[PDB]
């Protein structure tokens, strides 16, 4: 599970483009604080190896 892939981003990545920005996409007033739920989805996911 060491290898992890960026599952979600606000916009599609450009060709030959690297993005390491881990800022969360908070869609509401509720702070995520690492909690998965309303308006809070983590952009990274561990590989299902």
């Amino acid at each position: 599970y060491n290898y992890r892939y960026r599952l979600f981003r606000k916009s599609k990545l450009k060709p030959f483009e690297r993005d390491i920005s881990t800022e969360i996409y908070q869609a509401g007033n509720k702070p995520c604080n690492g909690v998965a739920g309303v308006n809070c989805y983590f952009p990274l996911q561990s590989y299902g190896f």
Binding site: A27, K30, G37
Partner: protein, 49 residues
């Protein structure tokens, strides 16, 4: 066990009503982000509840 298989067809969806419920209510989704169904269409919807 006798879950109601309520049909949803021929009507228009109002996902904006899905909010205003009790805070931090589970709002999980699979196969699509919850905010994209406004731009997506389907033949039928099952409102199992």
């Amino acid at each position: 066990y006798a879950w109601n298989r309520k049909r949803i067809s021929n009507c228009v969806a109002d996902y904006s009503v899905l909010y205003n419920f009790a805070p931090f209510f589970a709002f999980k989704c699979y196969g699509v982000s919850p905010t994209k169904l406004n731009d997506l269409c389907f033949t039928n919807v099952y409102a199992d509840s």
